[PDB]
Amino acid sequence: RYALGGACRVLAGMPAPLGATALDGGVNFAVYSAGASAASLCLFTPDDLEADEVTEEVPLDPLFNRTGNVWHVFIEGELHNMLYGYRFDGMFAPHCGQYFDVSNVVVDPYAKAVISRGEYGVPGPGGDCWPQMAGMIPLPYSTFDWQGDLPLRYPQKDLVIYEMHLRGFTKHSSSNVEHPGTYIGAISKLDYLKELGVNCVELMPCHEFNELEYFSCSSKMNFWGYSTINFFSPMIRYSSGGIRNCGRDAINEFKTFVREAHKRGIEVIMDVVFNHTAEGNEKGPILSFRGIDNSTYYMLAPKGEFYNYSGCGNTFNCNHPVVREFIVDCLRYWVTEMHVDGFRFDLASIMTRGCSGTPLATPPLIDMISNDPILGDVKLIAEAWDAGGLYQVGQFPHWKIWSEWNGKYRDIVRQFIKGTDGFAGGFAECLCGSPHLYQAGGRKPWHSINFVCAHDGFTLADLVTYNKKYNSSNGEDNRDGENHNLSWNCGEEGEFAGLSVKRLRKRQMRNFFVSLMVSQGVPMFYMGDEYGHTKGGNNNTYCHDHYVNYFRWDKKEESSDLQRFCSLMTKFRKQCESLGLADFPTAQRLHWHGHQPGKPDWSETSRFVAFSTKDETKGEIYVAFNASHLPAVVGLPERPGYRWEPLVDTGKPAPYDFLTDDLPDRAHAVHLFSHFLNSNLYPMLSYSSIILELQPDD
Amino acid sequence: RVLAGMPAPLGATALDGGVNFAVYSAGASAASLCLFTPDDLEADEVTEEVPLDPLFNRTGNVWHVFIEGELHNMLYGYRFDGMFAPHCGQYFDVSNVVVDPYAKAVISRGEYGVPGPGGDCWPQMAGMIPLPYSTFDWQGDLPLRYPQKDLVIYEMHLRGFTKHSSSNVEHPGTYIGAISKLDYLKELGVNCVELMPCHEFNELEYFSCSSKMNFWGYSTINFFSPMIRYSSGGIRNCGRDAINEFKTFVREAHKRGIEVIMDVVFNHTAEGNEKGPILSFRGIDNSTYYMLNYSGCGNTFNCNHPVVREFIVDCLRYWVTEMHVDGFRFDLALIDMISNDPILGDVKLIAEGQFPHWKIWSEWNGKYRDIVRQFIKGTDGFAGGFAECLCGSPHLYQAGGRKPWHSINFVCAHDGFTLADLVTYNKKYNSSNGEDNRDGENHNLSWNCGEEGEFAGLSVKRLRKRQMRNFFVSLMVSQGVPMFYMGDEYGHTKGGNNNTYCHDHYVNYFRWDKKEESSDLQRFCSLMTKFRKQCESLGLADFPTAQRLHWHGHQPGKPDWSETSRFVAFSTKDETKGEIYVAFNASHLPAVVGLPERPGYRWEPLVDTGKPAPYDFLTDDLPDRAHAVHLFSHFLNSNLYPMLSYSSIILELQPD
């Protein structure tokens, strides 16, 4: 046949590879739809797509343009300036699970760019929020230069992770970047992270999503982005190019980001959400999979009701034979072409469920992922829990590869440092990387990702300022977010407290950071914790394109003492050999002390934890935490012929809370405590911690 | 020409040109006046003798003789005789020549430690004939009359003060050798200097027996005469130069603002019992002047007798008016007479709660020394006693109608361990006294701070420095009059010997060499003396009241008086520093102590005996003071302070 006025020949094509692929002076399209009775290929143009008008349509022959359940067609010519979609026909029965309709033009799941809008937060032509979408037709060749980029391949034990929101990182006016809120605005700030000690960035979801899902209903916005439309394409409204050049520019922008990050020694880990899609339940848009083969992609009940183990309306059928191949191809695409270094899986315990619902001991999807020759060399971090009731923390089909977030760490550290009884043994266990959870099954201490604050919940500053949540601007009447925050307002609630309360809060924040940085495992903290970012007591800000979610670069200058403390702690962890251990610590390296050396207090009323550990580069170090409300003079280990020299004391005023060989009068400061240090003594305030280093006494 | 004579004065005087000699006796049936020439006295020959008539030259029991002429270059004695019955109580003998009890000078020897011809330790003595006119210029003088509550007494031995070769003085070990160093004392803050006995005494009294010498000088021959062998002139000019040199000292001291308190011993004399030579008293009236052994010397001076009482009163008046002495100490101590005398009533009378008071007689507080030595070293049950001592011992003096400044506080003296020995030795080492280490106090209440002796570790030495500073702080914050002993301010040590009465050796000298090596302790002591004399609360005229003095423990307002308590803290309301907080930690464990809460104010470090010098006492002369306070501001802001074991601290309340 012919497609465009006789210029393009139409042929049978090939059923693989799926998607649209350029070759042989033409483009081959292939899709999978088992339940379709008729299919046609729709072609738009940039001008007609913004009219909801199809410029061309090629009907597909069920005989010569279908192999098995895979429709395919080859069109000769240069279509790389056009956008495409599919029209399917067939059975329609919501109560049976069929959602075919000829009036809808759907987007290929394998499309590498989805073009519907170019401006963030700006409705469509006439106040619309769900305009027509179309996918990008590839080009015969690539148009990006990597400049010899190669994988960094850091050992996971050497990582310090930083969780970043791409828009909120530079969208505040104080960022003073050329393109605030985009992939290029982020690049100008990468050196800052490099000086902070960060060598790994975790991006919050940067896959195509609609920020205007809720805008029509209640004028809210999907700021965080945990509702994905397509998985092969980056968010085009996080780029400066926009829909320009059919989206190719946006792709290159993302690539640019990654490349630059590798030239500063920073790795990029993508946050992916495969457990649900933007299409919602039966009352929602038909953009994608639902319109192609619903029964194949979504997990339904026998009566046609969608299984909802995420709270978002549906549940992706992760373990179905086709869905597993789709997911593996997504991951390999993001690794081999966008040069990503690893992935984080949100609500990971939905990929371990049956393709009905029943948790699987050896899920096929995890099996394929961990056995892949390409995905075996990249980091895989799992947030092992879901909204249905599963908590696979410590028990996850890890295959001796998968890492995992540690929420027990968060709870234990929060309660201990706030001053709860019965948490000294748990805190001591946390400081060693939880051997009882990861050593038994054959995993190393660095398979645990440690954190005390994330994007969901109180920030580090709110953790020491508010007893309760204040989610009133969310519009839910406080009926949202965590109810048990394990926080302490340090004696007076709100930001307007006395000077003693403020000093105590500063001590507490420094104590949390020290706990993170001296523990075995991979530390992680959310952007803005290094300078005390606050959200006003709101622990669930999923819908605020407001300054509360933005990095405040002006406030970073007012609190640069805390930033200095945090960067110095990261440097110290990097230097100390004993803090990045590959294996679990042993009783021959690590010793536990109490108020007196060698006499730990593991009882239920204990609120003091101290240890000392040998080190090949620093000789030996001593760390202590006093979470009681009364000060104490503690005795230090006896080391004939050596002396303990102070390094870190969170109770002292800056810059003396961390001593470096840049202070003009460090020796005088040490001398004025020498009369305690010579006796192997050290006085400590309530709610503090100290780090000392052993040096030759000569 | 020999004339009759008159009873008054009971001595020798140059009035009525000529000399009138009068002597009281009770059994002198024969009496004559011997006159010696100094060259003849050296040869032990009498060059003149004037017999006295029992009727023409005697009124009642007083012999008289008046000689018209010039005897200014002549010495004298008496040929008294009468009943001789040692087994009955009489010691009259004409063959011997005695010295007038009221003689102002005694001329036997002129070089300290150098015996007479053929090694004679007891050569013949004679008295000096006075002049009818004065010879010394006071350059204008008047009593300083300091209130006794404002004193800081410094006990010094005259010879040992500037006899060591490191003193670098023109006349080491004399009266005029210590005048140079008086300025040094003024730098320490000494308001008063107390002299160990400077009456005429024989340093070779028992040198013939064994080989020991008498160094301290607690044995008196003449009560009117200064020690001539402590002067550069010696016997020159009949000794009248010596009496002037002493005066010079007093004068110069009064020009530095320092008073002079004289240590007197009227409870025994060098006469011995019946074995030593008869110098005076026994050869005139051995009954009136002696109680025919409670002093430990061999005799007592019969304080209770009208003749003896008048003698003592006249001696004290002579010293006060002729020599301008400001006060007296009475060893091992008539009383009403002295206290009611027109002149001696305004003199500072100090006696070594049981001694008659009359609201005048101060006392050496020997109970203070025992309690303070036992609290500071660490001992159970002394928290209450220590707190009592800090308030001037009300239970001893307030009850009797006295004042806190009638208590003389000390922890060290000339007998016993020095300050450095209290923290160095646990036993006494008197084997150098040649008495089988049996002569000496056995209950020293000391502690070697761990290892005993001068060769210990570093921690022991640090603890010793802390302990010495703690003792001095204890002294300087207490209500009463503090006293120190020569050399404590730099760590003088006797080598463990707590009784050096018989050593004219470097152990009894002021080692000016060492004071240049322990200058940090001297700095601390001088600064503490400055601190005491500025505060109003530390020199109170009346006992502290509950309205101004408050007692604290590890927590403000919660003192621990139990038998396990080893921590004492208080705060006082001042009017020149606002308010001061003092704390003592005699426990072996460090401690963080909470300070009293004062809205709108903050406590600022002043004294901390655990810190290294010069930061053990903060002063504006220290350029780093602000940074040092800043580095403890994080404890100070919350009303906390960390303390080492065995340490004390002083803080001031500032409007911050």
Side-chain angles (χ1 to χ4, degrees), chain A residues 392-465:
Chain A
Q392 284 185 288
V393 168
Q395 294 288 327
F396 187 87
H398 48 85
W399 258 263
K400 288 176 262 244
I401 289 166
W402 286 64
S403 305
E404 196 212 289
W405 278 25
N406 197 336
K408 301 177 185 298
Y409 182 97
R410 178 184 64 75
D411 297 342
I412 290 166
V413 170
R414 283 191 181 200
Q415 281 173 298
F416 178 83
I417 281 170
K418 81 176 274 280
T420 311
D421 287 335
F423 290 91
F427 191 76
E429 189 69 7
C430 289
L431 289 170
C432 296
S434 300
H436 66 294
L437 297 179
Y438 297 97
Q439 190 179 35
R443 286 194 288 179
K444 326 306 291 222
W446 42 266
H447 282 99
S448 174
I449 314 299
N450 298 323
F451 67 99
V452 299
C453 295
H455 67 275
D456 61 90
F458 279 154
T459 62
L460 191 66
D462 289 345
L463 181 57
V464 301
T465 310

Side-chain angles (χ1 to χ4, degrees), chain B residues 87-283:
Chain B
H87 57 288
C88 303
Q90 296 285 272
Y91 291 91
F92 284 88
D93 184 337
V94 67
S95 71
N96 293 313
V97 202
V98 285
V99 168
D100 192 9
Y102 289 70
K104 278 86 189 47
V106 181
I107 301 300
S108 60
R109 294 179 295 106
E111 294 183 359
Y112 188 91
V114 159
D120 189 358
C121 294
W122 285 107
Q124 177 63 58
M125 283 175 196
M128 168 245 294
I129 310 281
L131 296 173
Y133 55 88
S134 175
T135 59
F136 171 75
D137 180 0
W138 296 88
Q139 299 186 335
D141 201 358
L142 188 70
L144 289 189
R145 307 302 304 168
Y146 289 136
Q148 180 170 308
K149 84 199 189 263
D150 299 335
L151 294 181
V152 178
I153 301 166
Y154 180 84
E155 187 186 5
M156 59 167 258
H157 192 283
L158 184 69
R159 181 172 174 80
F161 187 50
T162 53
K163 178 61 187 178
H164 196 270
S165 67
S166 61
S167 60
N168 265 131
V169 198
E170 292 178 352
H171 296 282
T174 64
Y175 298 111
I176 211 150
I179 287 172
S180 322
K181 300 298 188 179
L182 290 171
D183 270 316
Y184 161 79
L185 296 179
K186 184 178 178 181
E187 292 172 355
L188 281 172
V190 172
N191 256 314
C192 184
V193 84
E194 177 171 349
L195 297 173
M196 292 180 70
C198 290
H199 296 268
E200 180 60 23
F201 74 94
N202 190 335
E203 75 281 20
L204 305 175
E205 185 233 329
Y206 48 75
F207 182 77
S208 179
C209 180
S210 189
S211 61
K212 296 186 286 180
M213 292 178 62
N214 192 358
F215 185 79
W216 286 351
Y218 284 94
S219 175
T220 306
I221 310 182
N222 211 76
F223 290 103
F224 288 83
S225 171
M227 181 66 161
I228 74 197
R229 288 174 291 289
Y230 281 163
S231 35
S232 64
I235 62 169
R236 192 179 70 198
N237 202 8
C238 260
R240 143 184 55 270
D241 290 348
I243 272 156
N244 282 339
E245 286 179 64
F246 183 99
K247 284 179 178 178
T248 303
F249 179 85
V250 171
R251 188 191 71 199
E252 298 297 310
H254 284 170
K255 287 191 286 185
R256 270 82 171 179
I258 299 165
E259 303 185 338
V260 179
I261 288 174
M262 254 201 71
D263 187 346
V264 280
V265 183
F266 289 104
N267 84 11
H268 70 85
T269 64
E271 285 294 308
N273 169 40
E274 56 182 357
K275 303 292 184 179
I278 295 174
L279 314 168
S280 183
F281 298 126
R282 282 192 301 166

Side-chain angles (χ1 to χ4, degrees), chain B residues 491-543:
Chain B
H492 183 63
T493 180
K494 302 290 182 185
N497 190 337
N498 68 354
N499 184 354
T500 56
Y501 70 116
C502 60
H503 292 287
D504 187 19
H505 296 85
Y506 63 123
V507 298
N508 284 325
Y509 297 170
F510 193 115
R511 303 272 331 243
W512 300 94
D513 153 28
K514 313 254 203 59
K515 175 210 75 174
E516 322 277 348
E517 300 175 2
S518 156
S519 65
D520 45 87
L521 185 62
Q522 216 249 9
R523 176 189 176 276
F524 183 91
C525 297
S526 67
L527 289 167
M528 272 312 288
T529 314
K530 230 169 284 158
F531 174 72
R532 179 184 177 85
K533 294 193 292 193
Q534 294 177 348
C535 299
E536 169 219 80
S537 149
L538 306 177
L540 293 175
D542 261 19
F543 290 88

